Design a protein around this ligand. Structure first.
Ligand SMILES: *CCC(=O)N(c1ccc(C(C)C)nc1)[C@@H](C(=O)Nc1c(C)cccc1CC)c1cccnc1
Ligand SMILES: *CCC(=O)N(c1ccc(C(C)C)nc1)[C@@H](C(=O)Nc1c(C)cccc1CC)c1cccnc1
Lengths: 304, 304
């Protein structure tokens, strides 16, 4: 028992991290097969961040201007192209450590692990979620650009995020591995405010199920509610609307605990209205929303 | 910016996880050089957990009774010995993935990463701390035994914990890699209650420093205190006593922020006395104590 914010083991991704330098800028790249993926803003200078014309900046760059280093050894760049906001640098050597992989574009509320890197070297791994406003609350310093988000299904790594920037409010924005930003963000040093960071309701309910499985049951009440009644409360507290799809996804947790989804919604409703009164759930004094129903089942069953 | 509960990248440890089976029991082992380390309770049957005599149980076991599997391949066991509560199984093949490593016995309040494994396969990585009562609040299911705790200094993994058991209260107990339990726990299915889980004061202060660096400064007050005055409040709230050694360890964070350690103690004192009034610090509604001063500096500087 016990419930932790668990990240996937990072070994398979560690074997893909490289350093990419273009002129004076150094960031992280992701080496899969004979292609190194990195944020296109690696080509930007200091007086470029304000309003960069990436196509024009890219014309002044040749294959030899992209320095790619994997460990202590240099990779030879034989081609380069820009796909949306990422650069794809073709190298002459396929990464011998390339795992089975997919590129996936995740939906808000979905979770993933991040391997934070600097100079192509991994420094840490943490679990986070794509917020409903398409930002991520990460831990990224200058040089972390190019660090990636991923999920693992047995031996297949599904890459879903590449870090590009920090917004003026300290939250993070990035792309999928096709270079498309999550949300309306642009790779430009300009005024970009994030929308309402609403709570991921289905994730909170999954975590309330995790709490019941692990013995924290004080919040369980004698009430029930309806999807419409619950949603009126959820809107009031800036919680995402709960749909019948969410109820369906929570089915296995409802079945394991014998607590119907709508009864758990009524427990959640009373926690929103009354607060926690100085009590804790799974060692937290607030309602946790960065565990999906899939994560709760996976961690509670020990999927390797 | 941003501050996350970050674990070390787990790749180096993933390459050391093996499955150990003795009779009908399967748990995790740690393969370093030509030795596989695992909890000695792998030799216990069902009617043994109550009061096992490990030396007597071990006499009935030969090298061929310990099945060690690394991936899909079997390791040949050429020797076995018991060192305290761990078994050391000598194999005929040195692990080709053995990283530079040390075995260290950590002190309470120190943090480490855990690679939770089942059947010798890694399923997740999380960061935790050795509690002042020598338990760990982990996420371990049946079969997780043998999963290990570690810290990494550039390329050297310092193994500090091996999981052995869950206490009747859902908290976890284990040994260092020499087989010595942390705390007074024994590898026996018997009444073992944990002591007071006090808060790691130096860690809370480090995390308050992390908050100030990341912009969360609302809790900073106009007060100061003394070590003795602060400690009277800390005892009242089951916080560990703060020593001059702790003040010294917080020196770099005090210097970076310009906030003297005793002023941060006075802020912490007011948070203990007044509570958070529904506010949050670094996304938490309670005072976090599983980041050491070293972790705060490392995460805030990006040590790879
Ligand atoms: C890897 C590059 C980097 O660290 N950062 C960066 C710098 C420039 C650009 C574009 C050319 C605009 N993108 C990323 C920063 C970063 O995003 N800095 C930043 C902050 C902190 C706030 C507002 C705007 C900007 C852009 C200059 C970085 C720093 C910390 C974490 N992630 C990224
Ligand atoms: C790897 C073995 C295992 O999963 N567990 C176990 C079983 C037996 C023994 C000894 C022979 C006594 N040690 C460990 C359990 C475990 O500790 N079970 C347990 C619990 C949950 C509560 C009170 C006592 C015991 C011992 C039987 C395990 C389960 C979950 C997490 N860690 C370990």
């Amino acid at each position: 028992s016990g419930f932790r914010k668990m990240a996937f083991p990072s070994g398979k991704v560690e074997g893909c991290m490289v350093q990419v330098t273009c002129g004076t800028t150094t960031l992280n790249g992701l080496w899969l097969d004979d292609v190194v993926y990195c944020p296109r803003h690696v080509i930007c200078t200091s007086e470029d961040m304000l309003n960069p014309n990436y196509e024009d900046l890219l014309i002044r760059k040749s294959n030899h201007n992209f320095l790619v280093q994997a460990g202590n050894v240099q990779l030879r760049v034989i081609g380069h192209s820009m796909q949306n906001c990422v650069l794809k640098l073709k190298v002459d050597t396929a990464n011998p450590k390339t795992p089975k992989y997919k590129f996936v574009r995740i939906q808000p509320g979905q979770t993933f692990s991040v391997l934070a890197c600097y100079n192509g070297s991994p420094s840490g791994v943490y679990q986070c979620a794509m917020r409903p406003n398409f930002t991520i609350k990460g831990s990224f310093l200058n040089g972390s650009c190019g660090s990636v988000g991923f999920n693992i299904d047995y031996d297949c790594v599904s890459f879903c995020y590449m870090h590009h920037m920090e917004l003026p409010t300290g939250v993070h924005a990035g792309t999928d591995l096709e270079g498309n930003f999550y949300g309306p963000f642009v790779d430009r040093q300009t005024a970009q405010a994030a929308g309402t960071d609403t709570t991921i309701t289905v994730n909170v309910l999954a975590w309330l199920y995790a709490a019941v499985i692990n013995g924290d049951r004080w919040f369980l009440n004698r009430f029930t509610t309806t999807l419409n009644d619950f949603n009126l409360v959820a809107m009031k507290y800036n919680y995402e609307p709960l749909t019948q799809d969410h109820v369906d996804i929570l089915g296995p947790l409802s079945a394991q605990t014998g607590i119907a989804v709508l009864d758990m919604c009524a427990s959640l409703k009373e926690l929103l209205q009354n607060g926690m009164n100085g009590r804790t759930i799974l060692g937290s004094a607030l309602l946790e929303d960065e565990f999906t129903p899939f994560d709760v089942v996976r961690q509670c069953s020990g999927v390797t």
